[PDB]
Amino acid sequence: MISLIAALAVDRVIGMENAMPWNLPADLAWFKRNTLDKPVIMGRHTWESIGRPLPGRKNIILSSQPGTDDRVTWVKSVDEAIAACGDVPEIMVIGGGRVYEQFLPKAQKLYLTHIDAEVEGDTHFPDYEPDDWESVFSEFHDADAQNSHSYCFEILERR
Ligand SMILES: Nc1nc2c(c(=O)[nH]1)N(C=O)[C@@H](CNc1ccc(C(=O)N[C@@H](CCC(=O)O)C(=O)O)cc1)CN2
Ligand SMILES: [Ca+2]
Ligand SMILES: [Cl-]
Numbered sequence: 503m504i505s506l507i508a509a510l511a512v513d514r515v516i517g518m519e520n521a522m523p524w525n526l527p528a529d530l531a532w533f534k535r536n537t538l539d540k541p542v543i544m545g546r547h548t549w550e551s552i553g554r555p556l557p558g559r560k561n562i563i564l565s566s567q568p569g570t571d572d573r574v575t576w577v578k579s580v581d582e583a584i585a586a587c588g589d590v591p592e593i594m595v596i597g598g599g600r601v602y603e604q605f606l607p608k609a610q611k612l613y614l615t616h617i618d619a620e621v622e623g624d625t626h627f628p629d630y631e632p633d634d635w636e637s638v639f640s641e642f643h644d645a646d647a648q649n650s651h652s653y654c655f656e657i658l659e660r661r
Contacts, residue, residue, distance in 0.1 A: 503591060503592050503593065503610050503611075504584075504592075504593050504595060504605055504608045504609045504610060505592050505593065505594050505595070505609060505610065505611040505612070505613060506594075506595045506596075506597075506602055506605060506606065506609050506611075506612050506613070507533060507536060507537065507594050507595070507596055507612075507613040507614075508596075508597055508602065508612075508613075508614055508615070508627050509522070509526075509529055509533075509614075509615040509617060509653075510614060510615065510616050510617065510627050511617055511619050511620065511621040511623070512617075512618070512619065512620045512621070513620075513626070514626045514627045514629075515621045515622070515623040515625065515626050516597065516598065516599060516602075516623070516625050516626060516627045517621065517623050517625060518547070518548065518551040518598075519551070519552075520551055521551075522619075522621065523619060523621060524617055524619050524650045524651045525649070525650045526615075526617070526649045526650060526651065526653060527648050527649065528643065528648070528649050528653070529615045529617075529649075529653060529655075532613075532615065532655055533615075536594070536613050537556070537559055537594045537596070538558050538559060539558060539559065540559055540560075540590065540592055540593065540594050541559060541560035541561075541562055541586075541587040541588075541590060541593050541594065542556060542559045542560070542561055542562065542593075542594045542595075542596050543562045543563075543564055543583045543587075543593060543594070543595045543596070543601070543605070544561070544562070544563060544564070544595075544596045544597060544598075544601060545563070545564050545565070545597065545598050545600060545601040546563060546564075546565045546567070547598055548596060548597050548598050548601070549561075549563045549574070554573075555573050555574050559594075560575065560587065561573075561574040561575065562574070562575045562576075562577060562583055562586055562587070563575070563576050563577070564577055564578070564579075564580070564583050564601060564604075565577075565578065566578055580604050580605065592611075595609070598625065599625040599626065599627070599628075602627060602628055603628050606628055606630075609660070610659065610660045611657065611658065611659055611660070612630065612635065612656075612657070612658040613655075613656075613657055614655070614656045614657075614658070615653050615654070615655055615656075616653065616654045616656065617651050617652075617653045618645075618651050618652045618653065619651045630658070633661070634660060634661055635658040635659065635660055635661055636658060636659050636660075636661040637656060637657070637658050638657050638658065638659050639655075639656065639657035640654060640655070640656045640657075641654065641655045641656075642654045643655075
C-alpha cells in the first residue's frame with residue numbers, strides 16, 4: 503500500500519528540505535518516525551538533494567536514466583518501483599512533485615506537514631479534494647526554540 507509524505511508551505515508550494523526557509527527538527531523527526539523500516543521511493547532530484555541513503559529504509563529512486571550510485575536501488579517505472587518493494591505493508595513516496603503526481607492515484611494515505619511560511623516556488627503538491635479524503639489525525643504546534651515556524655501534522659485516509 504502506497505502512502506505520500508510531504509511538507510507543504512502556504513498554497514501548497516513544495517521544495518527540497520535543504521532549500522526551504524524553515525528549520526523544523528520536529529518535522530524531520532515525524533518524517534523519520536513515519537518512514538523508518540519502510541521502503542521509500544523518490545525521484546532523482548530529491549535523491550541528489552538528500553545526498554545519502556536514509557538509513558534503515560530501502561531507498562528507491564525512480565529515474566529513466568541509469569543509476570550513478572550503487573548504494574540505492576534504481577527503477578524506471580512506477581510498476582517497477584512497487585515490484586522492487588516486495589510484499590510490505592506500506593510504501594512511502596517522498597516526492598518530488600512529478601513523483602507525487604504519478605503515485606497519488608494509488609495512494610491510500612497522506613502524511614502531511616502544513617507549515618505556516620510563504621515561499622515562492624514553481625512546484626506545488628497536487629490538489630486533494632475534501633470528498634475523497636478523511637482527516638483522521640491532526641496535531642498543531644507552535645514555533646519554539648527549536649522550530650522556526652508553526653506547523654500542523656496531519657494524516658488523511660482515502661475516503
Ligand atoms: N515531513 C516532511 N516530508 C517531506 C519533506 C520534509 O522536509 N518533511 N521533504 C521536503 O520538504 C521531502 C523529504 N526530504 C527529506 C530530506 C531530509 C531528510 C532527513 O535528513 N531525515 C533524517 C532525520 C535525521 C535528522 O533529523 O537529520 C532521517 O529521516 O533519517 C528527510 C526527508 C519530502 N517529504
Ligand atoms: Ca532549509
Ligand atoms: Cl524529485
